[PDB]
RNA sequence: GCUUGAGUCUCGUAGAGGGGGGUAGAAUUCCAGGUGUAGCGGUGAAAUGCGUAGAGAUCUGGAGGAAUACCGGUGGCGAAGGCGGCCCCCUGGACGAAGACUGACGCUCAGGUGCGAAAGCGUGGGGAGCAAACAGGAUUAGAUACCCUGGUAGUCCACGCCGUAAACGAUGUCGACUUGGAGGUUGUGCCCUUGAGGCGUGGCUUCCGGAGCUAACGCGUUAAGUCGACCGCCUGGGGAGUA
């Protein structure tokens, strides 16, 4: 699982890799791929909008089924697979009618196991039901927010939301930010935590690791001139001002969510 | 811990209170965890209980009279 | 006012104060008094007498509710917990029962290690 | 100081609260063998019988209610 | 195989609707070769404390011999069945007769 | 644990009859069978140190019986370690 | 060869023995609301603190974490550390009855290996109560203490690590023998359950005491008595369990 690398070289000194020998070894299922041209952080106007993005290895899009709209057809997990686009291992599931789909591999899933969608489904890990058939207290993942939209919460590695209380039409999830929230009861949500739970113990070792995961260097504020950042300048290492993002607004504590439109589902913001 | 005490009572009659637990647990649990003095106090008092049994066995004396 | 019929009388008797409060079947307070508010700031409020004075001063302010008979219910140890019963009796309340809900943990939280 | 388990074949059960309601007090809490006889073996067996009763709500943990 | 003793308290509405419960569970033990030895239902009894408020539940006893797969059937149904409030399985108790 | 069923299976397999239960060969057979059954319950739970001490005593007592057997009859020692798969 | 040591097996028994997973109730805290008011709290007395933004009190609902009131017992189990709500799963040991089987398969162990309270350390969660550090109040000649109000690590969970304690019956392990008394607990045989029983015998066990031993206190069939085997260890105090 989590094997630390021997220090034959500076930069390998500190690497800690996450191997998953159960993963597939070879090319992926082709009919569920498509080109994923990189962006480098630039919108249709050409300009960098989110800095520190661009480069890195190339990767194709593994079309991961999220809606999970195949009710009443049991699907056997054909093989786990490494998905670059994502934090979690994907799983290639084969339905009894000759269908193959990618899903987010839950924590306890193995090649050959059997999962099932639908309202009729059981309460194994991997089964996706509307959060009206799922018992309260059950720990679900790949949760939806609008019935049929596809799934938007607890998608990444080792993440799950907890159905803390059901109430009529509205099921209350405590979200992994520690944030209470309500969703419509009709929203599908597969069962069980998401696999690759250890994706948080790998440490990348060196600078090239980020540089090929697609990140670019983060020049601090105080390393720039006054013209290029609110921070910046001095005759050697001066800050003397309250920290702010490069575009002015104050950082290190300043609450910026202001929606007023989805406040009714927020029961208790994170803390 | 609860008694009706029919109004023709004129009494305290709460011997149930100081006979069952109220102070026997509360004023000694109100503080003081210490994890180890229970055994120490236990065998001090238990030596005294066996000493009461020894008194009851060997209570044959002469009254100095 | 509201002409409430009957009620319960909670005596939260601590080692320092003796809080007397009057409540009803539904558990809503009608008035209260405390041996620290009735004078006796300090060494005297931890005495049984100040407790009965609190019980008298809480029989006050419930004459306006016409409370007929009282279910006295006490809580915790202390010099009170008996003189407040005496005073809630001598105030002319038909003490219908003398119970308590004095809380006993079933070996729950660790208590403070105080008082060396 | 009678142990009903002296003639009680069909040893202590958690359904016979008819028989269990004698080994508790007004509060619902077990009584000591030093005061009710009850050979220690059967006192332990009835202790866990009363605990299972309480779980099945055949007996109250306290007399709070 | 072992001799478990199952008890479970069902809500009073589903006490109006109990017998299907016993029938299905005994069907499980049947189809898994176990054998039932008691069904001493006690009906609507009142609970000494308010359980999962709306007290005064309805008890059922089984006292059946079976293996752990059967008992898993029973216990998982017990947990994920919103009618039953507090089942409890036990061990041998040497399957018995009447006189609750 | 070795339910009476399986222990009688082993006694029949390794003994001179059904009465021969104390022979060194049958004691070694029972200890090995129980150890091989227990090693799975230990590779799970990984932390049951008291049961682990039980297992150590089992393997040490089987070691003592196997040493006694090799000292007494080398031929039966050979055939026994062959039949049970010990000390390859 | 042999069975008196040592084991294996058949039947059961008692248990906070162990690891894994569920779950219940009381209670402290927090959150939201209801009633209600100027006090709460704390102490030797106070004050910091909390309170008219409406607290403390009482009631209902919800969340979450730790430990399991009574049973409770020099009671039990374990090699020692240690282990106490209930239920389920995997698991070790002990011991009793009778009978059979092997036939010295034993005892003790340098080095080695393993387990080893609490604190503490790394990684990740969790965090109700308590609480080093810390801050304030008070005491005081001072008070970087006791005391009070708060409070972070930590205590909790998983996985590693440390490898120490007054880790102490300050009593190395195994075997034999040597007067007694009352107990506790767990087996079992016999006779009348003749009616809450009486007579034996196994195990673990607490206290008094005899011969003896000891410098004395004391130990006293569970020896510190009489011996046998193997191990560890000591050789004036301090320096020093330090360099």
UniProtKB/Swiss-Prot annotation, chain E:
Keywords, comma-separated and alphabetical: Acetylation, Ribonucleoprotein, Ribosomal protein, RNA-binding, rRNA-binding
Signal peptide: none
An example Gene Ontology CC term for this record: cytoplasm
Example of a GO biological process term: cytoplasmic translation
This protein's name: Small ribosomal subunit protein bS6
Quaternary structure annotation from Swiss-Prot or TrEMBL: Part of the 30S ribosomal subunit. Interacts weakly with uL2 in one of the 3.5 A resolved structures.
Posttranslational modification: 5 different forms of the protein, varying only in the number of C-terminal glutamate residues, were isolated. The sequence shown is form bS6-6, which is the longest. The first two Glu are encoded by the rpsF gene, the other Glu are added post-translationally by the RimK enzyme.
GO molecular function (one): mRNA 5'-UTR binding
Role: Binds together with bS18 to 16S ribosomal RNA.
Taxonomy of the source species: Bacteria, Pseudomonadati, Pseudomonadota, Gammaproteobacteria, Enterobacterales
Keyword Transferase: no
Record organism: Escherichia coli (strain K12)
Modified residues (N6-acetyllysine): 93
Homology family: Belongs to the bacterial ribosomal protein bS6 family.
Full-protein interval shown: 1 to 100 of 135
